[PDB]
RNA sequence: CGUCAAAGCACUUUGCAAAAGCUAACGUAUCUGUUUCUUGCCUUUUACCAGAAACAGCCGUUUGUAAGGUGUGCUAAUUUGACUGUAUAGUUUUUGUAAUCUUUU
């Protein structure tokens, strides 16, 4: 099958599976996160409260608590079993754009239009660290180790920071413009990155040079943050584009699947943790589950 | 007597125990009326039973097993029925009406069967607002009611084992509208818990009249008031009631805050900007708390089911006391071995008119589902066994007016609702277990305090449906003690 | 505080008190206190030997008291 | 307070207790107090030695009690909220 | 205060007393004098045990407190699914341009 | 109200006097273990915060074979003493 | 107007507490009350005439506390002020 | 928005005192006995008619004179009290409220004497008819005789407040007033839904009136029954409201003006709207 | 009144949902229509007389929730909830009758 489920009122942004592979969550401009099943593809809770639009979901690695990143500074927290509020992580003085989580579900990183990175504990309700750069930040990724945090800004310079040192250790180079989504592999050994130059580049974690520049997935005037993912094997790379197409790569530098279906710009493509399924979201208010037999 | 505030007394308890329940706006609430006929008319009609977990001074919880009785003069039937089961009688009397008919008619009939009495002077608040008597002249109007109770006692017995008076503990001043019942002992506590150390007992003796208090000497006397001797009662109870029902009311809301802060009652500022009667209710329920007095005034005078077993078995049981059943009653045996003894008086309609629950006191042992049971009648004797009939106990349940508590095993001491045992029964009908030692005896058929008298003929409007009417007339005889059917020679 | 105890039913009756130091006394109960200080008349000791010495009117302290009994029902 | 009301509720039942004395007493309880006074009947004492005795009536001082032992059904009993300006727990319809 | 003491409520506790004896069981009720009520209690005088039941201790008698164990123990949103389809667009290029 | 009055005139004034004079003190305890130190602050219950404390207390070997008096000292930097343990205070000046 | 108020500042540090009972207790303080009732975290307490046993959440009936042996790093002058 | 209002005691006092000439004077309800919305239903169903009240269309061997006992005819009033007893084949009937407590509050005519003053209408209270028990000690004597010297050091609760206050008179008069005034904090109806003088035509007509009137009184009463008979209980629904839909399109604008202007406005608008049709 | 927690707050405009759960005024008010029947006055049908049952509309009411508007504060104010909320060194609990020794198994 394919399954193009409808439900949201307005532009949807982010849609992700549990780490387990038993649910979706989705939510964009609706101010409504809508949970789903995978295997009778039905809705669940209408997580209501966020007074800004959602920009990023992420399941806790317990598969119970959910975290948002509203446009009104809040980062909310939700008990996916019951569906009640837990907290309002009040901090930033602007619009949050990305979130990331660890193994230990306890630490979270967010990224504002205040040019401020901030690490959060799920127990304090306050910031543990505050890394002020200069130009409004956009994408962030934290490693599996719980050590390296990658920041993506407007300079095209993916900076790398550790939790012990807090020094500008390294800076990725050769990306001319804008970053819309970082993504660390299931190894902890390589990033993915969507630039506004349409060069969906991979980078190294440890020597730190490029690997493979992919090219063929356009951003334009919309200025949405488009996403990228690593497949459960780390064989395939799934980048969406404003051309209504989900450009899946071969990770060897070869375009295999280029499946259309959406009527509007695509945002955050994902992969299921085990069985080969693709979550693809788009302003359109629609979502697909593209499979491979 | 009618509308004296019986059904509303229990409601006052209910409210404190069942948090969800709220008063309908138009009309009072009358928990324990239930029947839609009892609500169109508004008068209670069929006596209903309750049980609830009521607390006491200090805190001890007992399980009351109350029974609202119809106060209309014509259903005295359904006063007497449970009289042959209960361990005592609580009275309710209106401090404005006084002691009308049914109050005598019952007091008299109650002492005959050695029922110890507990007075509850209801609607006192009313005599402060409706009548607006001054506090001293109201005292006389109270005392007067208590006396007149006793003038109906004196006629039936000159004994001073009974004698209803607040000095002792029998009498309870309460208004079931505003939510407060107190005895003299309870009012005392109030002062005492707020002011160091004296006995409750050495206080409450002196609070009743023909006694006075000198604020100068701080001591009591029978001395006729020299100057400003008031009357202990009116000094320590009424006049600091009277104030309440004129502080709340008269919108001196600045004062109330300072005074109610003394007692550490803290309201929200919305509540003063509220409404007279339902502000009152809110204050009077925050100051006099739970109706503790009335609890303490029952558990001290109405005896526990064991103690009364001795006396109650003598006047009701026909047979000998020396027998094994006569003995098992006296000790209130709660074993398997013991013979099972009930005593059914009233049957209750259920939510559809089809069936009848039974209401019997379990006098001995245990009752459980599916037991074989010899259900005796009235005309029974050791000679003929034509009255007795075997039957199976379908459901045992504990009553609470509207809801019911499904129980597996009954026990001696309790009142119960039985399922299944109907068809043999019409009016009184003792139950007794089948497998027994010989000669099971009956319980005395209730003494109704009014003959039937009024007569009415009943033919069906269509004669083809005469069976159903006949089936119906049997069902009345079940749920209406004094009714009697009697087919005429003609066909009526 | 100061709950005046229920010793009304013991007034003008014989008693068998026990006190601290395993020492005990018989007497007619005359009066009692908030703190349970007691007034006994016709006070007789019960020594560890068992030798019973008549004393008279006596005021036992509250603190000391362990308990208070009745000889005859 | 609730630790006192539970006591008052076991009046009538049979109770075991321990005193600073060292001995334990067992009997039907008739009256209690906020002080922790007691009034019991048909008591069966058992000291450190093991010496049994009979005491018809007894009064106590709470100060002298170490701890009580109470029947089992007294665990389903209600534990109320009490309030700032009330002595006895009881249930509460009114404000708070 | 007594904010901490409410937090202990309904936990299995280990309570040492002035005598040396140690009681164990859940905590049902608590006081300003530190009167504790305990459920299904067991003393350990010391290779020893006894079963009591419900025990009410005084404040005088109690020394220390310690937890043994922990406390004992949105229907359907609007969204709907559908099957497949995957239409091809005649045009290429981005969404806003043309 | 009246608590202020007694701190100046009464018995407790001599600690307030001594502790302000920067004085040392000998305290006899209920533990049978005397305390020798200099005081920082005190209270109406005799709840005292001591600094640089040194104890003096006897002992026995208690049938080691199947014993004699031994004195033992220990220095403590800071010590809050609950006044219930105190039985006797000796407010001795250096001068 | 109490020295007890100073102990509410004390929270967080470790102390070896002595009691009337004659025990000794190393552990971190969490909270201190006006009635002296202290609660401790990560405790190693030892009884008079027994081996030391570690307890997680110890709390003490203030009445029994003889004295706190405070850590040497704590400034007294700052804490004695309201 | 002007929903919900809360009024002071003295204010409600004046309003009462100003409106006095309109609102009623019954307080009891017993007054109505056979003049309730229920009774009038049964009348309608039994096809009988009660004297002062309305009269509708109809709605819809064993007897033997020699078996009956003729003793006092049995009136129509009797059937409308106990319809199941005195009347046979009784259907579509409603049973009425049998009696209420009876109010014993007479309001103070001469407002100088205090709020709590023994009125001369109440009977003396004498009790020389009675015969009580006898005890030698006497309850009061005994109670003091046990210990006369004992004391109570604290004195009563409200020993500084006096039983009356400034408004405690005015207030008691309200408690026992007709609906709208007793409330002292309401809701806010609309001028159409405040009937003013409906209670004139319930109480039932004072004597010595002409037939012109007495007939009108009934016709008014009929209506009031006939509604209270069919009143439905309202259906659940979301609020439509036309006049806020039109306000949400771009074709209507809002402004505030004088009444008489907007009366003329309409009166004209309609003139033209017919002319253009003609 | 006191603590803790949550939240901007009061006032207002629209949108969207609901409103017998255990016999009860969503509205102490109250109007028109359709169908099916029964009777009135009647022969032109409409327009009507005045009862019933079954459906409908209309004029209104309440609540929750979402987005807004005005005035005020976001270096504050207000609301809302929750609570095992009082201070006692001199006899019944938190300013100790404790301390100490020795023998038995
Ligand atoms: N003013 C006032 N009226 C009361 C009070 N208690 C009950 N009532 C009235 O008395 C009636 C209750 O009658 P009730 O005794 O429950 O009915 P019964 O079953 O026939 O006795 C209601 O109309 C109440 O308004 C009271 O304390 N004060």
């Amino acid at each position: 099958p394919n399954l193009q489920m409808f439900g949201h009122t307005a532009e949807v942004l982010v849609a992700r599976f549990d780490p387990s592979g038993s649910y979706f969550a989705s939510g964009g401009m609706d101010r409504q996160i809508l949970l789903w099943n995978v295997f009778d593809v039905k809705n669940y809770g209408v997580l209501n409260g966020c007074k800004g639009a959602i920009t990023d979901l992420q399941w806790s690695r317990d598969s119970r608590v959910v975290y948002c990143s509203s446009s009104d500074t809040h980062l909310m927290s939700w008990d996916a079993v019951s569906g009640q509020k837990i907290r309002k992580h009040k901090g930033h003085a602007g619009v949050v754009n990305a979130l990331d989580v660890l193994k230990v579900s306890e630490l979270l990183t967010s990224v504002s239009d205040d040019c401020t990175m901030k690490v959060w504990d799920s127990r304090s309700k306050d910031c543990i660290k505050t890394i002020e750069e200069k130009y409004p930040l956009t994408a962030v990724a934290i490693a599996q180790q719980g050590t390296q945090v990658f920041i993506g800004g407007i300079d095209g310079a993916i900076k790398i920071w550790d939790l012990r040192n807090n020094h500008c250790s390294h800076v990725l180079k050769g990306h001319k413009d804008i970053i819309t989504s970082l993504a660390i592999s299931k190894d902890g050994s390589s990033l993915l990155s969507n630039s506004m130059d349409n060069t969906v580049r991979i980078f190294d974690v440890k020597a730190q040079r490029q690997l493979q520049i992919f090219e063929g997935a356009i951003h334009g005037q919309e200025h949405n943050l488009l996403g990228v993912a690593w497949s459960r094997n780390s064989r395939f790379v799934g980048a969406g584009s404003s051309d209504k197409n989900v450009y899946v790569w071969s990770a060897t530098g070869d375009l295999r699947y280029v499946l259309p279906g959406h009527e509007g710009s695509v945002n955050h493509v994902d992969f299921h943790p085990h069985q080969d399924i693709i979550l693809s979201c788009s302003s359109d208010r629609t979502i697909f589950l593209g499979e491979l037999n | 007597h009618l509308h004296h505030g019986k059904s509303a007394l229990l409601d006052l308890l209910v409210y404190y125990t069942h948090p969800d329940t709220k008063p309908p706006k138009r009309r009072s609430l009358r928990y324990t009326d239930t029947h839609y006929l009892e609500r169109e008319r508004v008068m209670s009609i069929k006596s209903t039973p309750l049980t609830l977990a009521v607390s006491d001074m200090k805190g001890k919880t007992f399980a009351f097993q109350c029974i609202d009785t119809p106060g209309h003069v014509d259903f005295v039937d359904e006063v007497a029925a449970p009289m042959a089961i209960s361990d005592g009688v609580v009275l309710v009397v209106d401090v404005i009406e006084g002691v009308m008919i049914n109050t005598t008619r019952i007091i008299k009939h109650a002492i005959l069967h050695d029922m110890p009495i507990v007075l509850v002077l209801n609607k006192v608040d009313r005599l402060i607002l409706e009548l607006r008597l001054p506090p001293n002249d109201a005292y006389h109007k109270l005392r007067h009611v208590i006396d007149e109770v006793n003038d109906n006692i004196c006629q039936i017995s000159k004994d001073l084992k009974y004698r209803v008076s607040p000095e002792l503990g029998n009498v309870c001043f309460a208004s079931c509208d505003l939510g407060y019942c107190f005895t003299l002992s309870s009012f005392a506590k109030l002062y005492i818990d707020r002011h160091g150390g004296i006995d409750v007992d050495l206080f409450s003796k002196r609070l009743w009249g023909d006694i006075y208090f000198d604020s100068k000497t701080r001591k009591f006397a029978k001395q006729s008031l020299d100057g400003s001797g008031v009357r202990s009662f009116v000094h320590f109870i009424l006049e600091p009631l009277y104030k309440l029902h004129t502080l709340t009311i008269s919108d001196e809301a600045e004062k109330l805050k300072k005074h109610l802060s003394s007692f550490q009652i803290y309201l929200k500022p919305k509540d003063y900007l509220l409404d007279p009667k339902p502000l009152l209710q809110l204050i009077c329920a925050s100051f006099f708390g739970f109706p503790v007095g009335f609890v303490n005034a029952v558990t001290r005078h109405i005896p526990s089911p064991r103690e009364n077993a001795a006396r109650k078995a003598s006047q009701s049981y026909i047979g000998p006391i020396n027998s094994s059943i006569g003995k098992a009653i006296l000790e209130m045996s709660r074993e398997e071995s013991a013979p099972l003894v009930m005593h059914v008086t009233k049957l209750y309609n259920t939510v559809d008119a089809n069936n009848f629950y039974a209401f019997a006191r379990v006098y001995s042992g245990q009752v459980k589902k599916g037991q074989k049971v010899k259900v005796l009648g009235e005309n029974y004797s050791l000679e003929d066994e034509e009255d007795m009939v075997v039957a199976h106990i379908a459901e045992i349940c504990v009553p609470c007016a509207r809801y019911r508590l499904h129980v597996d095993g009954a026990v001696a001491g309790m009142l119960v609702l039985l399922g299944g045992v109907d068809n043999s029964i019409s009016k009184t009908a003792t139950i007794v277990s089948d497998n027994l030692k010989d000669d099971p005896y009956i319980f005395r058929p209730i003494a109704h305090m009014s003959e039937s008298v009024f007569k009415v003929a009943v033919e069906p409007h269509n004669p083809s449906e005469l069976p159903k009417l006949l089936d119906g007339l049997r069902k009345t005889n079940k749920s209406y003690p004094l009714s009697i059917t009697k087919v005429e020679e003609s066909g009526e | 505080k100061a709950g005046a105890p229920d010793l009304k039913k013991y007034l003008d009756r014989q008693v068998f008190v026990q006190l601290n130091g395993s020492r005990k006394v018989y007497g007619v109960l005359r009066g009692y206190d908030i703190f349970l200080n007691i007034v006994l008349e016709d006070s007789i000791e019960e020594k560890v030997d068992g030798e019973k010495v008549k004393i008279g009117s006596v005021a036992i302290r509250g603190n000391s008291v362990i308990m208070i009994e009745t000889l005859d029902k | 307070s609730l630790c006192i009301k539970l006591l008052h509720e076991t009046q009538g039942h049979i109770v075991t207790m321990e005193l600073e004395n060292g001995s334990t007493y067992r009997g039907k309880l008739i009256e209690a107090e906020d002080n922790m006074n007691c009034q019991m009947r048909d008591i069966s004492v058992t000291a450190r030695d093991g010496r049994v005795s009979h005491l018809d009536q007894v009064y106590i001082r709470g100060s002298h009690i170490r701890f009580l032992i109470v029947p089992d059904m007294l665990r389903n009993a209600p534990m109320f909220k009490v309030g700032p300006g009330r002595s006895v727990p009881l249930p509460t319809r009114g404000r708070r | 205060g007594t904010t901490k003491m409410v937090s202990l409520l309904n936990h299995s506790l280990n309570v040492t007393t002035k005598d040396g004896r140690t009681f164990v069981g859940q905590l049902l009720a608590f006081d300003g004098f530190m009167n504790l009520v305990l459920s299904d209690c067991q003393e350990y005088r010391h290779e020893e045990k006894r079963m009591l039941g419900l025990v009410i201790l005084r404040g005088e008698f109690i020394v220390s407190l310690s937890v043994q164990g922990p406390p004992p123990m949105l229907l359907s949103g609007p969204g709907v699914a559908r099957p497949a389809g995957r239409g091809i667009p005649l045009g290429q290029a981005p969404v806003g341009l043309a | 109200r009246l608590e202020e009055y007694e701190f100046s005139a009464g018995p407790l004034s001599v600690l307030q006097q001594a502790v302000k004079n920067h004085d040392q003190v000998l305290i006899n305890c209920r533990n049978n273990k005397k305390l020798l130190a200099r005081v920082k602050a005190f209270d109406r219950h005799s709840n005292m915060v001591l600094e640089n404390v040194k104890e003096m207390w006897t002992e026995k070997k208690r049938t080691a074979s199947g014993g004699k008096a031994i004195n033992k000292d220990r220095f403590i930097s800071k010590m809050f003493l609950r006044g219930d343990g105190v039985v006797l205070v000796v407010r001795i000046p250096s001068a | 107007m109490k020295l007890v108020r100073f102990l509410m500042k004390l929270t967080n540090e470790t102390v070896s507490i002595e009691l009337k009972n004659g025990t000794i207790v190393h552990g971190t303080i969490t909270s201190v009350d006006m009635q002296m009732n202290t609660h401790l975290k990560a405790v190693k307490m030892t009884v008079k005439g027994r081996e030391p046993v570690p307890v997680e959440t110890l709390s003490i009936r203030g009445n029994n506390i003889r004295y706190y042996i405070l850590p040497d790093s704590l400034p007294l002058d700052t804490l004695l002020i309201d | 928005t002007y929903r919900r209002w809360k009024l002071n005691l003295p204010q409600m006092a004046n309003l009462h005192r100003l409106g006095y000439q309109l609102l009623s004077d019954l307080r009891d309800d017993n007054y109505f006995y056979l003049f309730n919305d229920n009774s009038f239903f049964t009348a309608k169903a039994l096809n009988v008619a009660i004297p002062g009240g309305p009269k509708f269309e109809p709605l819809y061997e064993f007897n033997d004179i020699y078996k009956l006992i003729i003793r006092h005819p049995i009136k129509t009033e009797y059937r409308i009290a106990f319809p199941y007893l005195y009347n046979s084949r009784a259907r579509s009937v409603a049973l009425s409220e049998y009696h209420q407590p009876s109010n014993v509050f007479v309001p103070p005519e001469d407002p100088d004497l205090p709020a709590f003053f023994w009125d001369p209408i109440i009977n003396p209270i004498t009790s020389r008819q009675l015969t009580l028990h006898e005890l030698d000690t006497s309850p009061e004597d005994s109670a003091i005789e046990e210990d006369p010297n004992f004391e109570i050091p604290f004195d009563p609760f409200f020993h500084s407040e006096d039983i009356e206050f400034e408004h405690t008179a005015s207030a008691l008069i309200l408690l026992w007033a007709p609906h709208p005034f007793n409330k002292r904090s309401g809701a806010t109806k609309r001028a159409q839904d405040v009937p003013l003088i409906k209670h004139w035509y319930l109480e039932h007509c004072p004597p010595n009136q002409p037939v012109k009137v007495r007939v009108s009184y009934q016709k008014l009463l009929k209506s009031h029954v006939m509604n209270k008979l069919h009143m439905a209980h309202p259906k659940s629904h979301t609020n439509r409201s036309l006049l806020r839909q039109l306000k949400n399109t771009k074709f209507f604008q809002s402004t505030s003006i004088d009444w008489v202007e907007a009366g003329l406005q309409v009166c004209r608008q309609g003139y033209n709207m017919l002319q253009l049709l003609i």
Side-chain angles (χ1 to χ4, degrees), chain B residues 1-8 28 30 33 42-44 69-72 122-123 125-126 130 174-178, chain H residues 101 176:
Chain B
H1 183 233
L2 259 183
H3 305 303
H4 275 22
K6 299 187 276 280
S7 304
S28 81
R30 297 173 311 293
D33 268 22
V42 182
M43 75 209 321
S44 306
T69 60
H72 187 47
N122 196 50
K123 306 213 203 156
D125 70 326
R126 198 155 147 258
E130 270 184 13
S175 37
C176 298
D177 166 64
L178 300 173
Chain H
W176 312 106

Side-chain angles (χ1 to χ4, degrees), chain B residues 47-213:
Chain B
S47 63
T48 95
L50 248 172
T51 81
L52 45 137
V54 176
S55 309
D56 194 14
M57 253 196 269
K58 302 107 172 61
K60 174 152 189 200
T61 304
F62 321 86
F64 282 17
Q65 297 198 98
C66 322
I67 307 181
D68 318 60
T69 60
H72 187 47
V73 73
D74 281 354
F75 309 107
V76 284
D77 336 23
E78 300 157 301
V79 177
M83 271 285 266
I85 295 161
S86 61
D87 308 37
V89 133
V90 165
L91 255 195
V92 165
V93 172
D94 282 356
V95 169
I96 297 163
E97 293 204 32
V99 184
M100 309 284 285
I101 299 167
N102 264 26
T103 38
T104 68
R105 185 217 262 272
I106 283 154
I107 278 163
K108 298 203 174 184
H109 178 99
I111 293 161
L112 283 182
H113 313 311
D114 284 23
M115 303 299 280
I117 281 201
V118 186
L119 247 201
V120 176
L121 304 198
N122 196 50
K123 306 213 203 156
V124 181
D125 70 326
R126 198 155 147 258
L127 129 162
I128 299 184
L129 305 175
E130 270 184 13
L131 270 169
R132 46 187 231 290
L133 316 182
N136 303 57
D137 302 10
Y139 163 90
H140 297 291
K141 175 56 190 176
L142 278 170
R143 153 170 262 187
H144 176 83
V145 173
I146 289 163
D147 286 359
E148 182 49 45
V149 157
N150 293 334
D151 285 290
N152 307 317
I153 295 190
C154 281
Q155 289 173 304
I156 301 309
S157 194
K158 301 296 299 192
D159 196 8
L160 47 71
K161 184 72 168 58
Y162 307 116
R163 184 170 162 283
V164 183
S165 106
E167 179 197 30
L168 304 179
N170 301 318
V171 191
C172 235
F173 315 92
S175 37
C176 298
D177 166 64
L178 300 173
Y180 65 85
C181 310
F182 62 76
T183 49
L184 294 179
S185 297
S186 297
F187 221 89
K189 254 224 160 181
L190 276 155
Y191 288 115
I192 288 185
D193 299 18
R194 182 176 131 76
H195 271 107
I198 25 273
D199 291 72
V200 173
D201 310 2
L202 301 174
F203 206 119
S204 43
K205 286 176 189 173
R206 300 166 166 87
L207 288 177
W208 200 232
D210 212 62
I211 293 173
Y212 303 79
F213 181 89

Side-chain angles (χ1 to χ4, degrees), chain A residues 3-20:
Chain A
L3 281 132
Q4 180 186 352
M5 45 269 150
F6 307 89
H8 297 256
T9 65
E11 303 136 38
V12 191
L13 304 186
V14 189
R16 303 195 175 189
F17 299 98
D18 287 33
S20 47

Side-chain angles (χ1 to χ4, degrees), chain A residues 2-6 41 43-44 46 82-83 242-243 245 259-261 280 288 290, chain E residues 74-89 92-95:
Chain A
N2 271 344
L3 281 132
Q4 180 186 352
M5 45 269 150
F6 307 89
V41 197
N43 245 28
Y44 282 128
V46 194
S82 63
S242 58
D243 320 332
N245 313 312
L259 41 91
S280 46
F288 279 79
Chain E
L74 306 169
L75 305 172
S76 56
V80 185
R82 244 195 150 77
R86 207 137 210 165
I88 314 303
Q92 254 296 329
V95 77

Side-chain angles (χ1 to χ4, degrees), chain A residues 176-192:
Chain A
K176 223 36 282 130
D177 174 280
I178 311 197
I179 31 143
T180 62
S181 91
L182 310 178
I184 288 162
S185 54
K186 298 198 173 181
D187 307 357
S189 65
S190 31
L191 307 185
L192 271 162

Side-chain angles (χ1 to χ4, degrees), chain B residues 130 132 151 243 250 275, chain H residues 103-104 106 131 158 168 183:
Chain B
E130 270 184 13
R132 46 187 231 290
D151 285 290
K243 304 255 178 123
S250 316
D275 231 56
Chain H
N103 214 40
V104 193
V106 190
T131 59
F158 301 137
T168 202
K183 207 103 297 294

